[PDB]
């Protein structure tokens, strides 16, 4: 970002870290086989 | 009388006293049929699968 918008930039810009969400899906092998 | 006797040690036997069976097999004759699951992942045989 431009600071206080010479042209200066802020020295501590925000960084966005992607988050992970998980789900375990369990299926019996006889249910899928039959 | 033309109908063969088939051996099977899986027919129970307890102090003598076993049993004898007579079968007619076939779907078209309305007899006895076995049932299996045709399409399987792994599929090493008729109704059989091996998976890691």
Half-sphere exposure of A3 (CA within 13 A, CB side): 8
Segment 1-52 of chain B within 8 Å of chain A by CB? 37, 40-41, 49, 51
Tokens of B18: 């076993």
Burial of A33 (0-12, 13-18, 19+ CB in 10 A): middle
Experimental technique for the deposited model: cryo-EM
**CA-based torsion, B44, B8, B28, B30: positive or negative:** negative
Could you write out the DSSP letters of every residue in A1-34? -BTT----B-SS---PPPP---------HHHHH-
Q: Given an 8 Å threshold on Cβ–Cβ distance, is B37 in contact with A34?
A: yes
Query: Whose CA is closest to A33, among B33, B46, B47, B52?
Result: B47
Residue B44 CB contacts under 8 Å (≥ 6 apart), including other chains: B50
Residues of B in contact with A34 (CB under 8 A): 37
Phi/psi at B32 (5° precision): -90, 135
Q: Residue with structure tokens 């925000």?
A: A14
> What's the reported resolution, in angstroms, to a tenth?
2.9
From CA B46, how far away is CA B37, in angstroms rounded? Answer: 8
């Amino acid at each position: 970002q431009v600071k206080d918008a010479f042209v200066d930039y802020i020295d501590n810009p925000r960084e966005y870290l992607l988050s992970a969400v998980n789900t375990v899906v369990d299926v019996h092998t006889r249910i899928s086989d039959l | 009388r033309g109908v063969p006797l088939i051996p099977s040690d899986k027919v129970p036997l307890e102090n003598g006293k076993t049993k004898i069976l007579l079968l007619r097999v076939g779907e078209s004759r309305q007899g006895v049929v076995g049932l299996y699951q045709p399409n399987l992942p792994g599929e090493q045989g008729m109704g059989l699968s091996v998976r890691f």
